Design a protein around this ligand. Sequence first.
Ligand SMILES: C=C(C)[C@@H]1[C@H]2OC(=O)[C@@H]1[C@]1(O)C[C@H]3O[C@]34C(=O)O[C@H]2[C@]14C
Ligand SMILES: *[C@@H]1O[C@H](CO)[C@@H](O)[C@H](O)[C@H]1NC(C)=O
Ligand SMILES: *[C@@H]1O[C@H](CO)[C@@H](O)[C@H](O)[C@H]1NC(C)=O
Ligand SMILES: *[C@@H]1O[C@H](CO)[C@@H](O)[C@H](O)[C@H]1NC(C)=O
Ligand SMILES: *[C@@H]1O[C@H](CO)[C@@H](O)[C@H](O)[C@H]1NC(C)=O
Ligand SMILES: *[C@@H]1O[C@H](CO)[C@@H](O)[C@H](O)[C@H]1NC(C)=O
Ligand SMILES: *[C@@H]1O[C@H](CO)[C@@H](O)[C@H](O)[C@H]1NC(C)=O
Ligand SMILES: *[C@@H]1O[C@H](CO)[C@@H](O)[C@H](O)[C@H]1NC(C)=O
Ligand SMILES: *[C@@H]1O[C@H](CO)[C@@H](O)[C@H](O)[C@H]1NC(C)=O
Ligand SMILES: *[C@@H]1O[C@H](CO)[C@@H](O)[C@H](O)[C@H]1NC(C)=O
Ligand SMILES: CCCCCCCCCCCC
Ligand SMILES: CCCCCCCCCCCC
Ligand SMILES: CCCCCCCCCCCC
Ligand SMILES: CCCCCCCCCCCC
Ligand SMILES: CCCCCCCCCCCC
Ligand SMILES: CCCCCCCCCCCC
Ligand SMILES: CCCCCCCCCCCC
Ligand SMILES: CCCCCCCCCC
Ligand SMILES: CCCCCCCCCC
Ligand SMILES: CCCCCCCCCC
Ligand SMILES: CCCCCCCCCC
Ligand SMILES: CCCCCCCCCC
Ligand SMILES: CCCCCCCCCC
Ligand SMILES: CCCCCCCCCC
Ligand SMILES: CCCCCCCCCC
Ligand SMILES: CCCCCC
Ligand SMILES: CCCCCC
Ligand SMILES: CCCCCC
Ligand SMILES: CCCCCC
Ligand SMILES: CCCCCC
Ligand SMILES: CCCCCC
Ligand SMILES: CCCCCC
Lengths: 336, 336, 336, 336, 336
Amino acid sequence: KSEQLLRIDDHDFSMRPGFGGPAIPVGVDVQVESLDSISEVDMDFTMTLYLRHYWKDERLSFPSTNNLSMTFDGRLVKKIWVPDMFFVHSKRSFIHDTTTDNVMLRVQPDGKVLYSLRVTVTAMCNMDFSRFPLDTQTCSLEIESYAYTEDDLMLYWKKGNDSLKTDERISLSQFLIQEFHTTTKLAFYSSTGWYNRLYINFTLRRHIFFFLLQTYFPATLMVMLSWVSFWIDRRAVPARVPLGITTVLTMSTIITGVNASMPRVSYIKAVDIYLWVSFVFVFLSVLEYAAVNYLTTVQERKEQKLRDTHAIDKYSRIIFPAAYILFNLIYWSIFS
Amino acid sequence: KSEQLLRIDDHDFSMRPGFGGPAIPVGVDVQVESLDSISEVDMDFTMTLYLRHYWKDERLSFPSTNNLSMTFDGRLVKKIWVPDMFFVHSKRSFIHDTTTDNVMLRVQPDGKVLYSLRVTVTAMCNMDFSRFPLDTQTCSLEIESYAYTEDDLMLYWKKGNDSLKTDERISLSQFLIQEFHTTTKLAFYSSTGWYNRLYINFTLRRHIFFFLLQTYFPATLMVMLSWVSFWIDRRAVPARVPLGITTVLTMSTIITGVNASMPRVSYIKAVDIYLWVSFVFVFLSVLEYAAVNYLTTVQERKEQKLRDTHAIDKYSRIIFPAAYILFNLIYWSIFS
Amino acid sequence: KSEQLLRIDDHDFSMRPGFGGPAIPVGVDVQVESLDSISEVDMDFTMTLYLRHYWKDERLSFPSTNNLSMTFDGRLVKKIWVPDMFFVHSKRSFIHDTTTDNVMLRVQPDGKVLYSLRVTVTAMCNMDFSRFPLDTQTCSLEIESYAYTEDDLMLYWKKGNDSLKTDERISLSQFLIQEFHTTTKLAFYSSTGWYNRLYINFTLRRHIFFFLLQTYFPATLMVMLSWVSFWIDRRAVPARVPLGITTVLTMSTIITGVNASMPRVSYIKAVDIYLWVSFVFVFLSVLEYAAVNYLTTVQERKEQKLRDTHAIDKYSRIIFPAAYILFNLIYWSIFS
Amino acid sequence: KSEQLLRIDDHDFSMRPGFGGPAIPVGVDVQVESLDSISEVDMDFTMTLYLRHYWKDERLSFPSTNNLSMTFDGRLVKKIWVPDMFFVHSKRSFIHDTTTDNVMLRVQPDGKVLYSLRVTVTAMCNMDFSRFPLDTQTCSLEIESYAYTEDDLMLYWKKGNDSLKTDERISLSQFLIQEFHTTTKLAFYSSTGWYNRLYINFTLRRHIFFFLLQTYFPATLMVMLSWVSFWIDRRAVPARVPLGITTVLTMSTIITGVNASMPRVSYIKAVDIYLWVSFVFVFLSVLEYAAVNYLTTVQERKEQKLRDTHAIDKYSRIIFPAAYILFNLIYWSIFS
Amino acid sequence: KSEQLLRIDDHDFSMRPGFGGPAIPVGVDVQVESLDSISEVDMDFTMTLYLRHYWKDERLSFPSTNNLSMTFDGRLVKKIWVPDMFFVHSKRSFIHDTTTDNVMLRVQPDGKVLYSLRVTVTAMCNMDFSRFPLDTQTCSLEIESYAYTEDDLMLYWKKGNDSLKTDERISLSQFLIQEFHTTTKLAFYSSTGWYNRLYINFTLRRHIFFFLLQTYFPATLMVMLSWVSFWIDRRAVPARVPLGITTVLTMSTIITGVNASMPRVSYIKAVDIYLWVSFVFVFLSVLEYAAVNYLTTVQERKEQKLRDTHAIDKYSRIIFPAAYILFNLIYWSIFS
Ligand SMILES: C=C(C)[C@@H]1[C@H]2OC(=O)[C@@H]1[C@]1(O)C[C@H]3O[C@]34C(=O)O[C@H]2[C@]14C
Ligand SMILES: *[C@@H]1O[C@H](CO)[C@@H](O)[C@H](O)[C@H]1NC(C)=O
Ligand SMILES: *[C@@H]1O[C@H](CO)[C@@H](O)[C@H](O)[C@H]1NC(C)=O
Ligand SMILES: *[C@@H]1O[C@H](CO)[C@@H](O)[C@H](O)[C@H]1NC(C)=O
Ligand SMILES: *[C@@H]1O[C@H](CO)[C@@H](O)[C@H](O)[C@H]1NC(C)=O
Ligand SMILES: *[C@@H]1O[C@H](CO)[C@@H](O)[C@H](O)[C@H]1NC(C)=O
Ligand SMILES: *[C@@H]1O[C@H](CO)[C@@H](O)[C@H](O)[C@H]1NC(C)=O
Ligand SMILES: *[C@@H]1O[C@H](CO)[C@@H](O)[C@H](O)[C@H]1NC(C)=O
Ligand SMILES: *[C@@H]1O[C@H](CO)[C@@H](O)[C@H](O)[C@H]1NC(C)=O
Ligand SMILES: *[C@@H]1O[C@H](CO)[C@@H](O)[C@H](O)[C@H]1NC(C)=O
Ligand SMILES: CCCCCCCCCCCC
Ligand SMILES: CCCCCCCCCCCC
Ligand SMILES: CCCCCCCCCCCC
Ligand SMILES: CCCCCCCCCCCC
Ligand SMILES: CCCCCCCCCCCC
Ligand SMILES: CCCCCCCCCCCC
Ligand SMILES: CCCCCCCCCCCC
Ligand SMILES: CCCCCCCCCC
Ligand SMILES: CCCCCCCCCC
Ligand SMILES: CCCCCCCCCC
Ligand SMILES: CCCCCCCCCC
Ligand SMILES: CCCCCCCCCC
Ligand SMILES: CCCCCCCCCC
Ligand SMILES: CCCCCCCCCC
Ligand SMILES: CCCCCCCCCC
Ligand SMILES: CCCCCC
Ligand SMILES: CCCCCC
Ligand SMILES: CCCCCC
Ligand SMILES: CCCCCC
Ligand SMILES: CCCCCC
Ligand SMILES: CCCCCC
Ligand SMILES: CCCCCC
């Protein structure tokens, strides 16, 4: 029996290697397999990855006539000491087990150990959508030991920045992913002490032109179309009135449709300001003709009692486009 | 073997410490890690936290030549006595188990024990939406012992109000969170007796300006736009009629769009009252013109058979805005 | 050891108390903790409750110098006999297990046993929506023994109608709950025999005024608006035609919006009849003006070749409202 | 101990009864409790039922001084031989386990065994939606042995067609259920051989009148409303043009609303043909007036330069209704 | 006992057959039962299948007086050596277990083993939607050993291209499935070495005519309808203006409805280009009449101060259709 080469019953595996002395170093490597999904309302993401550990334990040394190592499955894990990593700020996770548990142990003759497993994790990520759709988000995944402080276990990336590998075909449906890198930091708990923590960081961006074409284009077109009425003769009331009222109706339907398809985040975003200012411009163009119609009727009644283009139209033809251009300049300077 | 220092087999661990005498006190600490989500249709919320227990048991004392403690994982729990806490009014919960069970036990040489675990819980929260979107909600999470009354187990907060800690970056997408504090209260069950219960309280609020801009602004603009027809000549029937009918259509589409985007709660809310009163104001503007046109036709026929502005318009120009302003004053005094 | 006071190994716990003789009575109490959700499409509801059992077994009697009882957790269950209750007509259920299994056993010195557990269950409920939104539903939850007939186990409510308790703040978001009571009935299975079954009954109702305001009010307003054209001069064709066609469009949008927000039940309901009759009334008013315009053109052309209000308008002004009022009287007498 | 009356340790229970000889017959009965849900997009249904097995095993015979049988729970199943049935073409399934496993074994003194359990299963069902909403679907649930061919195990319905029972109040929200019956068939696997398979068959149908009223009625009404313009004076251009364009808008909104409420099946169905032919009829009536108005203006200009009802209208008044009637006759003869 | 024929206790089954020598060959067969679902936003598919393994082990040889084989269930798997296959790039999977584990082991007298199990797996699939709805996707399912490299275990298809069988009734609701075939390829890991990998490939396509009729047809019809105004007398302002503005409103509603019914993928697709170019064509025809009306009013004012068809309409009648046809030719040459 191979479990008789390792003196399982001659040693107590409830304590760490080197217990009572200096801390034991443990190295970590990670390979990212895929990004499964992202949730904007719940503010989390899901990832599948390979996790590997490296450490040395003299109690597992065995004699050999050559340099062949021995490989074991998940059944041996319960009989020896292994490091207890967990994912910080996660919501749910599990280890894959088809057709059997995806766990491996490899032991060298001199006592070096490799421990590998395949896991799926959902972790939290705070997001800010004030600048939507020109926003940028940064996310991270954190690893830490649950029960051992830095006095007992020393956690580090095995090969520095070379310890992170990502799949060539990783992609998301509605985001672009870039800038994977690794960092470390020390954390404190008043109950127990200081801990090492490892990080995996990346960035997310959207496709700008899609949102431009879907949202900003129709609003600009409707605002420009409402300016046509300033060039129609003022004597055609049944032509001037329906134009303005139907433009207002169209702008309202567009705004409702746009709201129906965005993530349901209930605070003011950058796209909302643009849409509601355009709605005010279309509203003001209808009141402009109401003032012209009233003053023309007043003059005709006074002339009849005694017995060309109105100035408001001429000034509107200049004022409305200039105001819209000035608003656009300020907006795109603020929001880049 | 470390389990031989603690005389596990020399004691019965189905009974509480101090059995037959005074109740054993147990202290509790809580650290809130995140708020995962909140559901308005089912009226519940989800939370992840650390739970910690403190107590003393002389049966676990072991000799030591120094003052170092021993740490064990979840495999020891089944061999000793531990407190049986549960969450009152909860719907589902679980303990995280990747890469192993997130359970820890630490024993001092004099017999003091610390018991810590990491858990996610879903709990019920009754809410009232009569004043939507100006409503305020209060929620709480409750802890109690399942099998021991106040005569056997004494449950209390370990450090008073300092025993509750919350994450620096706790947030929700559609709510504002504030005012965490802890309380205690005694509960009675007729079948077994009196129990101590612990509480964690917090408050929720919405972003008012977003809802103002999305809902109250368009309705007011449409109501004011319907008043333009009072200033247009009564002889232009093909201009006066379409304006009113199209304003009614626009108001109806806005109401349908707003209804589709709110949580599906089937009773009358504050925002419903405002919207349907504005729909009546636009409705009454169409009947006013119907009366003006009918009386004009009757007068003209009477004059021709025998062989200026109508008073209704002059009165309407004043009466409609004053009534709308009075309604707004009453509404905003009642709903603040 | 506490399990040595009870002669576990001296008795056979695969058989019921009193085996071979009269049936053993078992009493039941239920405390309803919350109603979690209800689904109209799948016709089921979810509930959380406490379940308690009472019976006597002399094999569990133990000597004592006093009258104190002993409490055990869920680990003792597998070593003794317990009743096997199950929920009839259920779809899924589970027992809570955080931080440990929510199971309790208390044994009296004379052998009386109390068995308590906390459970969540989803159960079916047939619903009929023919009278929506004026419908009323009755539901029940049923309890029965799986393997013992009435000749072996006798099941009853321990304290009659006082055995059911409900929470003071139990509520549903879209329903009103009323009239909790308990009942019993005998059931027959041809393979095994007769069984006792216990029932918990309750009733559900809706908020009528919300549905009235959301659905019946706008349709009535639009129907009344379509009658305005009967008072407009027939010589204004470009005002009479657009009014009718726009009213038809508005009614269609209202009907589509209402259908989009109701439960997706694919058969005719009370509200559907009302909406489509109002649609026909608005449709018939457009044909009315088509007849008036055609006859007027014929009359003028005949007179010119040969070289007031039309009666149809006068009669329509009376007939249409009378017909609508008659329809309303019949409808609301049938559907209350 | 009842498990010592049956000589458990004196027999090998890894081999079937009668091993080495003729196949052992096993009878099956089924009782259907409910139909839980049905998914048209994923093409599956969910069912809850009781499964009962009958067979004889002489090794389980025990002596008795009377004719009583012994009852056991699910704990005995692991110690004897039982048949290994499974559901063919299923997606997921489970056995209910509250308050304990819903499994029963009843053994006669002479060795006859009854094995009963309560199970929930999700099974696939291929559907064809070409004739929606006038389509009919057929579904089945299949039962087979996993590891034994017909040379070892003979599987059959115990009581012919009387072996299937259904609940008196089984129903679905959007379908009607009918025609339950049972069949059998032999199947071949190249790796192992022949197997017996058992079937449960039923039929599903829709409510026709609901779909008629929601879809076919409004489209026909709009098509008939477009014919009104043929009877209006050709000189009323601002009355003729908006009527046609608004009818087109109403029809388009109706089609979009109807599409939004159906299951998302991406190929041509029967209702799509009707709606899009009606849209073409409304489109063609607008071009008809564009032709009449153009020819009228050409004639007037020619006569003025030189110094009644148009035939197109007269012929359209007859042609359009006749073509629509003919289309309806063909459609309802093809789709019944 | 049957397990005493196989010398279980005489062998170490933690090591592979032939340890220390050449690699052991393992053959694989697959039968596909169904395709359960597909998610375009999350980019995965779900499959149910049978997996079979073939290999030889001398340690399981047993003497026999005939040539009959023995069959075992999943309980024997834990006592012998079996291959550890897993699915590469999978998100979740499980093995069916109703009414017991769907696992079979059959052993020949000479030591040949067949190992069969039934599993459901969800695997990722990168998709590209640039050419939607004329896009084509290719998918694969991958099988590999978790712990043994090519120096220990040789993995191959048992019968080449004949090792894959698919159900005759495999189908999807919204896709067509075709071209199943198998391949192999070697993969390298820097940590451990070289592995064999097996592939199963297939292709997906859509129903083109459905999307043509639902999307491209209404947009083309509305573009053609906007050309009618070029043939109407320029002096009918209340007929020309409403036609254009209502055409714009109709096109906008169509675009919103189509966007609401497509998968939520946030980048530009082929259908989006066609729809927004058609919207521009309708927008430009409204400015065309704005120019004609202004130039006519200027001329009449100049002539009055001093005391037929306008050319723009004549040229528009030719230019607009030619440009649309040219755009269609270029678009359909690019996207096939
Ligand atoms: C249907 C709509 C949008 C309105 C309705 O009334 C309007 O004012 C809008 C208009 O687009 C413009 C005007 O021609 C219209 C008409 O008389 O009825 C209709 C027409 C077409
Ligand atoms: C490799 O194995 C041989 C025994 O064959 C041993 O002598 C040698 O030291 C080993 N080398 C290493 C690097 O372990
Ligand atoms: C890893 O590389 C990144 C590159 O952005 C760098 O920022 C980071 O400091 C590096 N970490 C280490 C440990 O070198
Ligand atoms: C600290 O440990 C020493 C043992 O070296 C012990 O004698 C001493 O009492 C301990 N101090 C306290 C405060 O427990
Ligand atoms: C803790 O502080 C909160 C702060 O509002 C207070 O309400 C509560 O009473 C305090 N509890 C105790 C025990 O002091
Ligand atoms: C109460 O306990 C005493 C022993 O202290 C016993 O003698 C007596 O019978 C008990 N009475 C009851 C009612 O249990
Ligand atoms: C209990 O009270 C309810 C109240 O309506 C009644 O319906 C029921 O029949 C009563 N049962 C008994 C056993 O008294
Ligand atoms: C019934 O039991 C009696 C003894 O109680 C026995 O003699 C008889 O044979 C039995 N009959 C059957 C049909 O089991
Ligand atoms: C078939 O079984 C017989 C035993 O009756 C045996 O002698 C013979 O060798 C077997 N044949 C083969 C091809 O293994
Ligand atoms: C299996 O069949 C496919 C069918 O096209 C073919 O492409 C492939 O080369 C075949 N594989 C082998 C190993 O022949
Ligand atoms: C058509 C409305 C948008 C006008 C501005 C063009 C977009 C410039 C934004 C650049 C983002 C990097
Ligand atoms: C409240 C935080 C800054 C957001 C500013 C919103 C201003 C809305 C203006 C809309 C104009 C119609
Ligand atoms: C836009 C219509 C609302 C005008 C009144 C403003 C609301 C006043 C109360 C706001 C609560 C903070
Ligand atoms: C049912 C609770 C009282 C709420 C009062 C609603 C009154 C709304 C009137 C709307 C008039 C159009
Ligand atoms: C406005 C349409 C409803 C008119 C009838 C009034 C409601 C009567 C039914 C009341 C049911 C409680
Ligand atoms: C199908 C069950 C009887 C329901 C009768 C509904 C009749 C509605 C007629 C609507 C005509 C506009
Ligand atoms: C940005 C990737 C190429 C897509 C170009 C889209 C151009 C659409 C033009 C629409 C004209 C209104
Ligand atoms: C905001 C007030 C709207 C009503 C004003 C109507 C136009 C005024 C013409 C002088
Ligand atoms: C009537 C003079 C030209 C009108 C267009 C002015 C455009 C303003 C852009 C600054
Ligand atoms: C509720 C009134 C519906 C009919 C309106 C008729 C207008 C009256 C003009 C005298
Ligand atoms: C023509 C007099 C001014 C019209 C508007 C009056 C508004 C009064 C608000 C109370
Ligand atoms: C159902 C007939 C629709 C066309 C009739 C148009 C009105 C004719 C009035 C004489
Ligand atoms: C102008 C003659 C009457 C028009 C209605 C005829 C209907 C034709 C259906 C065959
Ligand atoms: C000279 C014709 C003017 C047409 C109206 C222009 C308004 C839109 C400019 C982009
Ligand atoms: C009035 C001149 C003919 C108009 C038809 C032009 C169609 C151009 C398609 C190439
Ligand atoms: C807001 C434009 C109208 C100007 C009134 C003088
Ligand atoms: C009198 C000129 C008014 C201009 C307003 C835009
Ligand atoms: C709604 C105002 C009506 C007044 C008629 C005299
Ligand atoms: C708004 C109605 C006024 C009535 C004046 C005669
Ligand atoms: C409503 C029908 C009126 C008939 C008058 C002659
Ligand atoms: C509808 C076509 C009419 C043809 C008249 C010559
Ligand atoms: C479409 C532009 C034509 C210009 C004719 C002079």
